Design a protein around this ligand. Structure first.
Ligand code: ATP
Ligand code: MG
Lengths: 29, 284, 583, 49, 256
């Protein structure tokens, strides 16, 4: 789901649902 | 294209004649009706019984089937219960042709045969379903395209049709109001199962009988009513399912189907099917 | 990122035919309808200076209260056009079960209520000279008892009252029926019992049980059909019985759909926008509207006033002569159609007073002071008393004399605007003229009803005895407020009243029907707007450049409902004041 | 008492709801907090904590 | 049943459907609409919405919740995705400031944003809520006159039309933090009465010459006073009495 209604006229979206740059420096040094 | 009377329709379309009665169209299935199993759901006992006996509410249905039987064997109108056109216009062709072909029909009470076998007589609706978005008149409703279907609560009894386009009026004029109101329209179909000793027999001119003997002694039909909507502004402060408990009946029931004539009715129709379909029309 | 959402804002339908599904969305009109219906760009609240001054559009919201109120009026505006046959109903169903089928329908109960009151109005005109009925029937409260108490028994003992309704249609279907009708014989036998049984003093419209217990019984005696006798004590537990289908959902504890209503609540709760959706709706179905966009300008602001010697009524002529231009410029096309009943014309004095009516300024006795009210003439001199007789004659004239046999309403108004000296006597006489009609409804519209019962700038010395007034003039003595002060909607056949209470100038001012001694049931507390409607408010404004939004604010719509608790004005400050940027 | 009817001006009001932006859980909850002591500005900053 | 008996007895009559739902464009159906007293009055504005009204009815959510649980209106999916748009943006209003200016004991809690940092130079006798009002009734008046009023008020200055060109491209400008950080992007005074200024002193000195000039204006009310100076900085991107003061000082440095 994405949305759930709490009560009358209250809609809200629900919420109760390899870095390269290091890959280089770790190689060089 | 032009306005046509009641009887002229029969005299124009029932001109055909056939020697074989089984080849001739006829709704009342003499032999081979099947005991259907009673379905049970949650949203069926909510309005079907409301401070009333489950049986006496069904006994009326047990009676309105009767005059329909007499209405076939006897060309009559006061007996003819409240029902649609497209069935009657297609049901009396199956009857009046036999009258033109020289055959005869008579209503018979075979008490003994019904006592020779089979359980007692009684009406029990084996299927009760609510639908939404449509009206009982089979001409306002459009094709399958504009309607959007919600098959979610089919298990409990509910189906909801919602339109994508604008519906027309008597004058042929679109509305935005009509779509919104159409989305409220609820209908209550019921499939009945009524075992009966009364039956029919066809008898050729100078013929004691020409039809086969029945095996079933059970017959079915469909009744419908387009309901009154709730009070205005009742939807707001209520849950949905608690809001459908408040629809109420004032319009009379309406026979639709009979022994799976036409394989059960359909509300939606293709464009050509609507054209071949006729409706009664007033002007001013 | 700025992949924000869009949203639809406006109702698909037009304004005459909304339903609950369109409660959130807006409507639109030209900007010309303001000048067309509301003269000189004065409207309810500040919709002109604030919302229209920026948007340049006459956009209007739909409220839960607004459409629900409009539901009631459409019945009144249909019973008139298509009345009901009493007989053909009971043919359908047994006389045993009428309540569960007939009475408790929404489309049937008002059709019964709407008819019994018309018969009641015809008789009350006889009981107008009585001081007592001024005290009881100034409100609609006790009316709705007597009209409902007849109907509740129709569910209990239909075998004793059902014949009345049935032959009433025989009397209507019989032309050449000179005698009175059944109900006009019914209510007469009621009111006579009131004068004889009720307590003269201490009889209140606001309190029910004191009125019922003072009237142990009704006793009807019709010559043809009935001698039915009634016990009122059974309807004492629940003086306000009302069918469930209307009243769980029409308006919170709202009872008088035909009489009127009243809106109270905190500032900016939404009251001064609901009736704007009504006033416009009132015109587009061709129903008369009596605008009073603000009573603050009448009661808390300077206008000339002049006193009459007999009566304490301070005449106002310039004030009325401006208002009538507003009532004229909006409702011009209808008034031409409308003729006059000259049997009614010409009983209103120049100071507004009517012949039959009680004295509009009786001599009151303040018990605590142990002195009368008339005593203030002791401080007067001889010359003023001599001048009074000179004014008593100069103000003696009435409008009947100089104006005889008009044909329409405008013929009174065109003469009223043309001559300052006869504005009041032309104003009031129009009110009888609109009130006794059966071609068009009446809709009395007020914003700032609170300001009336509050004290006024208008000074005098004769009200020094009232420690509350403190040398001021009440507006129930001022002429022009008399037309509208009286919460008398029941008096109008095919009529309705709407009132409101503005508290912008006041802080934390609890206003309600306890401040004004006012009956229950005829009021509706405002409350703030819900979330999903408070959402489209923002998206409506952002599309129309009303308030200028940070990217912080474009999705704060469902956040500000905390910051405002659904209140309008607490947002407008944020929307216009940009107080967000502080936090 | 009601929120707009106790904390009138908004700078008293945004303080108490500054966390509620930081949570992104707007309208999920119902709030009831009781306070006594001090003045308005000092009475609001406690609501942050 | 009344309509039935008439048709049974051959009182009323029957014919086929003139009404059939043919696929047509959204524009063609405009001819057959049923309009009431209101769409007529405002034609130009509604007549373009019948194109949009009918389009939305195609694209409807088949979600259970908007129909089957409580009252509510069908929404798009972006409403759930962009829930972080406030939380991600409000920080950026604050990311202008380096918090290293403010890490002292219990000052960050009361002074974190730019707007929280102007006021104390303007506070008189401990009143803050008053100063917050006077500054906003002024700055709010700036945005309103530029939008809805004429520009005779804005006849003197030169950056007038060049400022709206910066508004409509960026609604970020309505943040007072971004209004003035833009002003301070013009005016980063590195030197003053001769001394080098670190970042923690460069920022401070820019504000006093504002707060002083606010008190030097002739107009009585702060609302009137405070407007005139922001106009001298906003509407003169190149010039000001306060900026020409600065540019006068570099010459003293460069010559010396
Ligand atoms: N129905 C509405 N449609 C559009 N805008 C509205 C509506 N109701 C309120 N507003 C907006 O809120 C503003 C004022 O609120 P409203 O007119 O309801 O005053 P109020 O509730 O009577 O408060 P007060 O008692 O202080 O007068 C309006 O000018 C308008 O900007
Ligand atoms: Mg108001």
């Amino acid at each position: 789901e994405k949305f759930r209604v709490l009560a009358k006229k209250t809609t809200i979206p629900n919420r109760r649902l390899m870095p390269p740059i290091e890959q280089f420096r770790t190689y060089t040094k | 294209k032009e306005s046509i009377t009641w009887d002229e329709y029969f005299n124009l379309y029932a001109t055909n004649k056939i020697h074989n009665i089984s080849e001739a169209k006829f709704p009342y299935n003499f032999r081979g009706m099947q005991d259907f199993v009673p379905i049970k759901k949650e949203f069926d006992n909510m309005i079907f019984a409301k401070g009333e006996n489950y049986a006496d509410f069904c006994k009326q249905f047990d009676r309105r089937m009767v005059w329909f039987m007499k209405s076939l064997a006897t060309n009559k109108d006061d007996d003819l219960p409240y029902s649609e056109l497209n069935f009657l216009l297609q049901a009396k062709k199956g009857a009046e042709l036999l009258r033109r072909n020289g055959y005869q029909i008579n209503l018979i009470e075979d008490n003994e045969g019904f006592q020779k076998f089979g359980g007692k007589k009684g009406g029990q609706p084996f299927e009760i379903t609510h639908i939404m978005g449509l009206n009982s008149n089979r001409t306002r409703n459009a094709g399958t395209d504009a309607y959007s279907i919600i098959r979610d609560l089919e298990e409990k009894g509910l189906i909801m049709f919602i339109g994508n386009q604008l519906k027309m009026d008597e004058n042929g004029n679109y509305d935005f109001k009509l779509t919104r109101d159409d989305d409220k329209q609820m209908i209550l179909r019921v499939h009945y199962k009524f075992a009966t000793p009364y039956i029919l027999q066809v008898t050729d001119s100078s013929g004691k009988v020409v039809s086969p003997p029945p095996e079933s002694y059970i017959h079915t039909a469909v009744f419908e009513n387009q309901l009154r909507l709730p009070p205005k502004f009742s939807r707001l402060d209520l849950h949905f399912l608690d809001w459908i408990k408040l629809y109420r009946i004032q319009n009379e029931w309406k026979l639709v189907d009979f022994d799976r004539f036409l394989s059960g009715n359909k509300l939606i129709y293709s464009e050509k099917e609507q054209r071949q379909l006729f409706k009664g029309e007033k002007d001013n | 990122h700025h992949d924000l959402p869009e949203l639809n804002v406006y109702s698909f339908v037009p304004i005459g035919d909304h339903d609950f599904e369109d409660v959130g969305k807006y409507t639109m009109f030209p900007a010309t309808d303001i000048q067309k219906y509301f003269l000189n760009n004065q409207m309810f609240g500040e919709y002109f200076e604030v919302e229209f001054y920026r948007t340049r559009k006459f956009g209007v919201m739909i409220s839960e209260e607004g459409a629900k109120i409009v539901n009631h009026l459409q019945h009144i505006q249909d019973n008139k056009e298509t009345p009901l046959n009493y007989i053909n109903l009971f043919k359908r169903y047994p006389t045993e079960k009428i309540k569960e089928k007939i009475i408790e329908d929404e489309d049937v109960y008002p059709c019964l209520f709407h008819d019994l009151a018309k018969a009641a109005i015809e008789e009350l005109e006889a009981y107008r000279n009585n001081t007592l009925f001024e005290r009881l029937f100034c409100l609609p409260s006790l009316f709705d008892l007597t009209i409902n108490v007849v109907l509740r028994e129709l569910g209990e003992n239909p075998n004793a009252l059902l014949p009345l309704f049935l032959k009433q249609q025989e009397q209507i279907d019989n032309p050449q029926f000179t005698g009175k009708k059944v109900f006009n014989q019914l209510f007469e036998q009621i009111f006579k019992q009131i004068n004889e049984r009720a307590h003269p003093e201490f009889s209140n419209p606001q309190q029910y049980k004191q009125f019922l217990e003072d009237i142990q019984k009704f006793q009807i005696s019709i010559k043809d059909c009935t001698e039915h006798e009634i016990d009122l004590i059974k309807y004492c537990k629940e003086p306000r019985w009302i069918p469930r289908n209307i009243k769980k959902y029409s308006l919170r504890k709202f009872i008088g759909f035909n009489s009127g209503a009243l809106l109270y609540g905190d500032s900016g709760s939404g009251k001064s926008g609901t009736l704007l959706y009504v006033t416009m709706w009132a015109h587009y179905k061709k129903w008369i509207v009596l605008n009073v966009p603000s009573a603050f300008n009448w009661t808390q602001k300077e206008w000339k006033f002049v006193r009459h010697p007999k009566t304490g009524l301070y005449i106002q002529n310039e004030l009325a002569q401006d208002w009538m231009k507003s009532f004229k410029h909006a409702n011009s096309d209808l008034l031409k159609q409308i003729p006059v009943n000259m049997d009614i014309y010409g009983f209103y004095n120049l100071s507004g007073q009517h012949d039959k009516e009680c004295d509009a300024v009786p001599d009151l006795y303040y018990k605590d002071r142990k002195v009368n009210f008339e005593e203030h003439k002791k401080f007067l001199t001889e010359e003023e008393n001599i001048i009074d007789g000179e004014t008593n004659k100069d103000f003696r004239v009435r409008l009947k004399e100089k104006l005889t046999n008009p044909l329409t309403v405008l013929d009174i108004i065109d003469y009223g605007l043309e001559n300052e000296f006869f504005a009041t006597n032309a104003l009031y006489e129009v009110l009888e003229q609109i009130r006794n009609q059966d071609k068009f409804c009446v809709l009395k519209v007020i914003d700032g009803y609170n300001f009336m019962y509050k004290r006024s700038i208008y000074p005098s010395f004769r009200y020094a005895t009232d420690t509350q007034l403190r040398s001021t003039v009440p507006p129930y003595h001022l002429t022009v407020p008399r037309a509208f002060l009286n919460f008398d909607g029941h008096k109008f056949k095919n009529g309705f009243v709407l009132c409101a209470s503005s508290v912008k100038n006041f802080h934390k001012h609890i206003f309600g029907p306890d401040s004004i001694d006012f009956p229950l049931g005829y009021s509706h507390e405002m409350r703030g707007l819900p979330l999903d409607d408070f959402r489209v408010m923002c998206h409506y404004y952002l599309q129309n450049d009303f308030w200028l939004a940070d990217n912080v604010a474009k999705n704060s719509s469902d956040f500000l409902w905390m910051h405002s608790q659904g209140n309008w004005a607490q947002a407008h400050k944020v929307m216009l004041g940009h107080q967000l940027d502080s936090m | 008492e009601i929120f707009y009817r106790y904390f009138t001006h908004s700078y008293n009001r945004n303080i108490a709801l500054k966390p509620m932006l930081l949570s992104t859980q707007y309208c999920e909850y119902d709030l009831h907090f009781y306070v006594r002591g001090g003045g308005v500005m000092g009475q609001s900053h406690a609501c942050q904590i | 049943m009344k309509q039935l008996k008439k048709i049974m007895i051959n009182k009323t009559k029957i014919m086929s459907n003139d009404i059939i739902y043919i696929k047509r464009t959204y524009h063609q159906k405009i001819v057959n609409l049923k309009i009431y007293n209101n769409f007529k009055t405002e034609p130009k504005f509604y007549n373009l919405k019948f194109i949009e009204f009918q389009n939305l009815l195609n694209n409807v959510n088949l979600n259970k919740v908007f129909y089957t649980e409580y009252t509510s209106y069908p929404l798009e999916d972006r409403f759930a995705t962009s829930k972080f748009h406030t939380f991600d943006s409000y920080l950026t209003s604050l990311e202008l400031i380096d918090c290293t200016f403010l890490k002292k004991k219990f000052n960050y809690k009361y002074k974190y944003s730019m707007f929280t940092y102007f006021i104390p130079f303007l506070i008189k006798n401990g009143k803050k809520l008053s100063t917050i009002n006077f500054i906003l009734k002024g700055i709010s008046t700036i945005y309103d006159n530029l939008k809805y009023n004429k520009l005779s008020q804005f006849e003197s200055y030169s950056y007038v039309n060049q400022f709206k060109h910066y508004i409509d491209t960026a609604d970020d400008v309505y943040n007072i933090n971004f209004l003035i950080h833009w002003i301070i992007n013009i005016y980063k005074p590195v030197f003053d009465v001769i001394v080098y200024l670190s970042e923690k002193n460069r920022l401070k000195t820019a504000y006093k010459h504002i707060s002083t000039c606010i008190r030097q204006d002739n107009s009585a009310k702060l609302n009137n006073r405070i407007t005139n100076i922001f106009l001298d900085l906003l509407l003169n991107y190149k010039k000001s009495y306060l900026y020409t003061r600065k540019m006068y000082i570099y010459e003293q440095v460069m010559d010396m």
